Amino acid sequence: SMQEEDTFRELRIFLRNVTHRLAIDKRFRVFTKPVDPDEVPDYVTVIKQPMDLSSVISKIDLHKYLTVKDYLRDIDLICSNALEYNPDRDPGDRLIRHRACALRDTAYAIIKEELDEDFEQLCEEIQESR
């Protein structure tokens, strides 16, 4: 069953290309790093499960994502954290909230247009078999 490892290799490579495209985008630079504890001291008191695109790239290489659902759960976590933390008052707040939705939508859009359904389905079935 190297075919299962080839499937997981192929998945990781895909997910790296997607995460790369998001990380090089100027809009999502704020989501490439963890939140600055010194600049945003109350962030940790709101968000208990932080996520960013550096963490995602690390988890890809550690084999934490066996399915696209697993990957997109962390993408969603990045967005929901941003919408959970930031209020809807100042224009800086609205800029970041909008970028977070944009990050999520962009990820889902790329995957929808480039991921073969039968390949996604394969990965889902391999992890259930384990």
Partner: peptide, 6 residues
């Protein structure tokens, strides 16, 4: 700080 960055 209160909520919001910057």
């Amino acid at each position: 700080s209160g909520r919001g960055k910057g």
